[PDB]
Amino acid sequence: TWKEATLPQVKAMLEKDDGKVSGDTVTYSGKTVHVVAAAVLPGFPFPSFEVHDKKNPTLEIPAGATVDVTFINTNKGFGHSFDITKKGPPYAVMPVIDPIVAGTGFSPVPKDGKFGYTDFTWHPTAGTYYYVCQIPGHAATGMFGKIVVK
Ligand SMILES: [Cu+]
Secondary structure (H helix, E strand, O other): OOEEEOHHHHHHHHOOOOOEEEOOEEEOOOOEEEEEEEEOOOOOOOOOEEEOOEEOOEEEEOOOOEEEEEEEEOOOOOOOOOEEEOOOOOOOOOOOOOOOOEEOOOOOOOEOOEEEEEEEEEOOOOEEEEEEOOOOOOHHHOOEEEEEEO
16 A cells, blocks of 8 residues: 655665665565665656666566565656566557556655655566556656566
8 A cells, every 4th residue: 555754764765775786786685675666766867766776777686585665756746656567678658568567556746745655565486577667658768677586
């Protein structure tokens, strides 16, 4: 479900991502990993996803791990989504990415000084997946990243 957090809270959650960055790649390790993504942190290009302070990085996940994903929409005016699919780029204006493997659906826009966020779990099998936002035109212009489970 959808929850709300104040800026100090958002800032504290962003540090909860336990991957290591190398180039434009974030590598996770362990039985349970925590991915913390944000939709357009302030200062970053629009439209885009930020994970561990990097723009649309490629995520490296160990096959068999339990993936705990936390998604925060910090972009004023838009209700970005965070959906995992198997279909890769390029995406159309209205992406055709069914079936979604795991996803959040459209998020609430920031309001009253609070930002919406949600959590979901994922147990993926080895392979290649893509996290994308389904708002028309967004994925088409770069709001997607790659996930490598191996
Ligand atoms: Cu979006």
